Structures are given as C-alpha cells and as structure tokens.
Design a protein around this motif. Sequence first.
Motif: not given
Lengths: 346, 346, 49, 122
Positions: A9, A13, A57-58, A68, A71-73, A172, A190, A193, A229, A231-232, A239, D102, D104
């Motif tokens: 974890x 990502x 997510x937690x 993904x 833009x969201x996991x 990205x 957003x 970022x 980003x 952070x992850x 690819x 979760x 960006x």
Amino acid sequence: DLDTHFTQYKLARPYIADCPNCGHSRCDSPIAIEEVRGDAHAGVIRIQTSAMFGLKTDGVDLAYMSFMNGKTQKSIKIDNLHVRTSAPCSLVSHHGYYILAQCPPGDTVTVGFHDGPNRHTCTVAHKVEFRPVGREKYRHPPEHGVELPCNRYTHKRADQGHYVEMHQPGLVADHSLLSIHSAKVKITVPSGAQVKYYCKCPDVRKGITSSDHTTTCTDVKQCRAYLIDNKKWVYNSGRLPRGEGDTFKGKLHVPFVPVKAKCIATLAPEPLVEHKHRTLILHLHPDHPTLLTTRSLGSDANPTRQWIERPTTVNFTVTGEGLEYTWGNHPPKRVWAQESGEGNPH
Amino acid sequence: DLDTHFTQYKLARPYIADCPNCGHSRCDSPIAIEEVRGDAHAGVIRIQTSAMFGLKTDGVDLAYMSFMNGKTQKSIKIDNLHVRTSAPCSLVSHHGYYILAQCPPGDTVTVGFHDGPNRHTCTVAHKVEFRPVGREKYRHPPEHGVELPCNRYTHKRADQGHYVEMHQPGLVADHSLLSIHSAKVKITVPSGAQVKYYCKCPDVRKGITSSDHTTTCTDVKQCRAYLIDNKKWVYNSGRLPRGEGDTFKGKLHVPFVPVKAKCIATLAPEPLVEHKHRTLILHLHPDHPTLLTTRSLGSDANPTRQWIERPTTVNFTVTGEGLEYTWGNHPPKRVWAQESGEGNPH
Amino acid sequence: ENTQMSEAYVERSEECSIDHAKAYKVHTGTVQAMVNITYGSVSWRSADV
Amino acid sequence: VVQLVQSGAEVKRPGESLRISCKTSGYRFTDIWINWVRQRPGKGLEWMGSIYLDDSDIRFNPSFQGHVTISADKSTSTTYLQWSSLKASDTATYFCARSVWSGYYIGWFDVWGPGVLVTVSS
C-alpha cells in the motif's frame, strides 16, 4: 500475510496502461496485462495486471479491488473477476498487480472485471501450454497416480525471494482539464496536482498549483496539460511513458513465486508381459501418450526410447546379461532371460 | 449512423423461421441463424439471424432489440448478446438482421440473447477458421508486427455497396386461434389479419377480418388457419414459406460489407546467419509455423520454399550470381558470396 | 517528436532459482563402495570403503 | 481502529500566538491527506487547509495566508496548525479530518478529530 500487503500500500497505485483488444479493439484499459508467466506444470499461471486487487481506497479488505478510473483510484467489491484462456479459468488468488489462476491450454489470455455498467476486459495473445510431469502426456491433473516433484506457482500470499521495481510515474498527458474561460485556454488544476502545460509557443515547463490561462494560445488544440503526482508510485511498465523521476529504484516482493511441490502423474495401465524365452513381448495399452525406454545391462547399452500413443505390441531381445525397461511413471523393471530348452543336444 | 436503421425499419420485421440445436433439440426460435459469413482474416465474422437488433418498436435507440415472440414483435434491452464458436466471442457491432463479432477458431456458431425468464439460444454446425495474414501462422492478432493488407468485415454501421432481398412474407400457419364456440370450430381473427383458413371440405380460401365460424365439422384438428399480413416484410429466408403473390423485390443494405484494411502480422525472430564462405548457414528459431523462401539470382531461380515450425538449421549454396532469401514476414535479403581464401595458388 | 526509447535487457527469471540446468566438467575423480562382510562365526557387518 | 486525537479546549486572548495539533492513530501509512476546517459557533463549515503527510504538500484557502500556517512531523505522524497573532474572529471549533489519497483529488473525509474548541476574546 497482511504486512506485505500494507507495504504494497505504501506507494503503489493502479494505472491505465495500453491493452490490445479491449474486447474488440486496442485501447488504454484500467486492467492491462503485462508478463503473463505460464511456466508451471499442473497448469497454474500468474498474470501481472495494471490493477491492484485486495487494496481498497482505505485498507486491504481482501474481497475488494482497486483500479484507476481516470483521475481517481476507485475501489469496488470483487463481484466477477474472470480469466479465460480457452474456457473460464478458476482463479486461485489475487494480490497487488498479480492474479494467480488455473487455466486450460490455449492461444490467448484475457482478464476481466465487472464494474456493473462496464466490463473492462483486456486480452493478450500469449501461447500457454499444459505441462504434464513425468513420462506420460496427460492433459489435466489426474484424480490418482504417483506424486512427482514439480515446479508450480505457490498460492502463498507473499515471499521475499523475488522482487520487482517501483519508479515515479511519468507525467500523464491530458486534455480534459483544459477549457475556454472567455475566449482563451484555461488549465483547471485538480486541487492536488501541479499540472504542467505545454502549448503553442514555449511556456512554463514546470506547471503551477494555481489555475492558469495563457494568452499565447486561444484554442485548446494547441495546448495540453501533463497531470503529475509525486505522492504515489507505479511499477515501471513498458507501456507507460518514463518521466524525469530517475531515482528511487523502489522494491516490491513478487507475491506468487515458483516453488517445488508434488504433482500427481498418471499411472498407465500395466502391460501384458509374455516372457517367451530368448525375448520379451510387451503388449502396451495406454490412455495418453506414454513413454517406453529400455536398455541392455551389458557392455552395449543399446537404448530404445519411444512414445507409445495407442495399443501396441513390441518385442525386445533379452540376452543372458539383462534387460531393463521403464514404462510410464512406473519404476524400472529388470529381466534376465536364458536357458531356453529348444532342441536336444543328445 | 441514423438513416440506415430508418431505411431498414420501413418494411422489415423479425420472424421465427427455424434453428437446429436451439438448446438441445431442433425447434423454431426467434433467433434463426442463417448465412454465417466467416471469410475475413483476423477472425472477425459477421453472423446473420432472424431477430432485429439496433432498432426499437417505435424508434431506433441503438441499445435495443426487437424480436417476434409468436404474433407480436416485442422490443427488449440488449442485456447480453453472447456468441460462441469454441469459446465466448466479443461481439463488436449489430444492426438489423446482422451481428459482427471477433470469434476464435472453432467448428460451431451459437448465438443467444437473454430475456430474463428464458434463454432463446441457437447453434449451427459451421466451420470458422482463423486466417493469419502474411507468411506466418499466428493464432491470434498480436500487439506488434508488420502492417499488412488484409480484408475485414467493416464495423461501419452504414453502407450501400451490397444489398439483400426482402419479400412479402408467406402464410404463417396457426392453430391457436381456433376455438370451439359451442360445438363448432371458430377462427379468432387477431384484429388486423385477414386470416385464411382451410377445413375438411374446401372452405373460403381468401379469409376475412370478421371472426368466422363454419359448420363443416366440430374438430379443430382438421382445419387450420393461416395468419397473413401485408404491412411488414421479411428477408426471403429459405427457412420460410413463399407468398403466392410474386411481387416486391425489395433492397435492404447489408451493413457490414467487407473492406480492405490493415492487419498486424507477426514478425518472426531474427535468424542467425553464418556466412561461411562458398555457402550460407541459417539457424532459424521460429515461434509459429512460418515459411522460408529462397531463390538464386542467376539464369535459373532454383527456388525452395518450406514451412518451418521448430528450430532448424538450413544450408544454402550461394554462388557468385547471388541468392535472395525471405524468412517469414521480414523484408527480402540478398547475399552474394565468392572469393574464398581456401588454399593459395603459389 | 523525433523521440522514443525502447529499452530492453535480459535477466534471470523467477523459475531460474527452481529449475536450472547446471553445466559440470568431469575428471576421473575417485571410486568407492560399501561392503558387507562375514567370516567364520561373526555376523554380517558392513562399512563404506 | 483508526482515530484522530487533537489538543484540548483552549482559552486565550488576542495578540499572542497559538499552537494546536492533530494526531493519527490506528493507521500505519503516512499516505494520507489531513486537513483543517473551522466551524464558527452556530454557523457552517469552511475548509482552511490540507497537508499531505508524506511530503507536506500544502493546499490552502486563499483568505488565510499568513494568519494561519500548517506543518507536519513524521516521527509522531501529526499535523500542526499555527496562529502567529490571534484575532477576535478565531473563537471557534476546529476539526482535523482524514482523507486517504484517492487519485489527483483530495477525495472524501473518512474520520475526524473530536474537535478542538478555541476561545479567544477580551
């Protein structure tokens, strides 16, 4: 174990990597396929996807998957995660980027998960073969037989024997966060970022956390935003574009690694031995392609090895020094033959 | 697009013609497979059925499907249109009577659509092959290779190149709209069809809208009623009766006409060339059964072509005139060799 | 763009630590056995030799 | 179980400075956004700021520069809110909220601190 999952974890990502034939055409899919490793004997394979199974997510919550969606996991319950080669594989486990499954032989490998409105399939062309152990060519792990030493992909959650690298994700590219404010391009950061932007003429090649609108470009088609980003992290895949994050050769244990185990091998039907003296007739009645290997125990071995695929009768010449034959997964048998009484010296 | 569906709706309806192995036994299903069309290269096939996908009972609404269940064309949402040959296919398009999918190699074609209480499946014995492009026999399109010219059933919704015929439908036999009123047969016209009928003695052979009854006999078993309608047309299927009126040849565009396109063919691994002078050794290590073709460049070609499917080594005697060899899908190569240094003339 | 960096390099696989073929060289070396001996009234007794 | 614990209720006067903290427990990842929000007595909420624990990436409400500051410490895994010079308007409830990364976007606020009540007046 969960500590390895927690350490997975730490900076891993999901990512949208390129996949060929996302159902019916090339695309960039939330669950890609890279380096499918079908090398085990019984039939197990391991597929390193581009989606994190387990991790929501937690926390971990093994019955959840994460991927993904832009833009969201986003995390969901694993409702129907299927793998097909030529018939539906029975997936045995999943952890991190890796699925471990039991597939039949075929020319394709395809994974797919249900989001409920969508199917998010990914199909790669990779020949995978059944690899039976021993000296008989069966095509499914049999109910009974003899245990032989095989090398299969362990179902254990974790092991520190082997690793794979983690790298900072490449910037990205994107255009959906570019709009028109009044008559001028606007870059909508957003909130989390530092969107780099490159447009008509050379611009600020670092981005800014605040929303921006540049005067040297008027239409979106000469302006684009690299969403970034730090952070992850992501696993360095062929690819994805490689960014300037040329540091941090991060490490991840590979969950399911090859280890030794015991695989069942078919005991073929016992042959009919007709020991007519001066030779040995052998009626063999296989059910799968079986091996017959024989050698003489004298100064001249004179080996004879052949694959019997159907009922057959073979005659070997047993001299007075010895013959040995092994058939299927049976142990070697030995026969010494002489002293036939044909004729009369008197 | 939007107008092709409209032109296909102007007179076209579904029908229940016939299908063997609709489930487990031959029956009359609303999905009557007819004229399977597998002739493209990378496995894409175009199936033709008797249901009407793509258009509704009132509009088009592409995600819908109208099929005839008895005496009523009913429209339902496409929940899952599953197509299989030896494994599930990934259907990519549908329009009117036609579906277009990317099926794997097999020897059957089975289509089906769920309605919720029932399945309505239909299978046929058809031989569908996977035709690799170029000179290398891959068993599924790859993710990279050479871009060769193939022919595919286009995914384009609209076209006008080819047409099929629609005709006035024949007489739809029936016995269900034949009751016993008091002690005599009674035909119940379903409010819009001038139902024909025929009983023990030759009765009215033209039919009438009003619910008729005849005193010829008291048994429904010896009188039939032919439901008839002149307000919606059907493709002139061989599995349907032909109307007595030999009129209205009508054109219906075939949506997914074949077109030249660009497929991706495997590139064989680079062979190991050993230019030992006075000849040429070539170690070939293929992964699919490709072919090698070589020919001299002099006054006689002296050709040799062979399919290589496992690692092999081939020796070609190249003269001073030269020799041209091409291996798999690679571009042709040419080698000239003489002037070997064996021995000296002094 | 005038740019792309295809970068591939070989390495050992995860199965290399489980199934590998070792290449040994061979010289004459030695030869031994394990005998089992009895003489007279003493019972069988065996030993590597 | 994850928990956020803040400092106790504070009483002060305008003019001096103030320090408050929020601390994470029951979680072993520093991969988390922790954010500061204020509720005025009887009124609604207003997001003050947000700090990412790993690298202290600061997102800020644009009416609070200088008057407020946010930092974080890694040995204790906590976030720290600073007022260099209090004002009468700062008497309020302050909440630290937990939003796991979760994508960006800051995402959603899983769990919250019980809420530190600061009373500044004359």
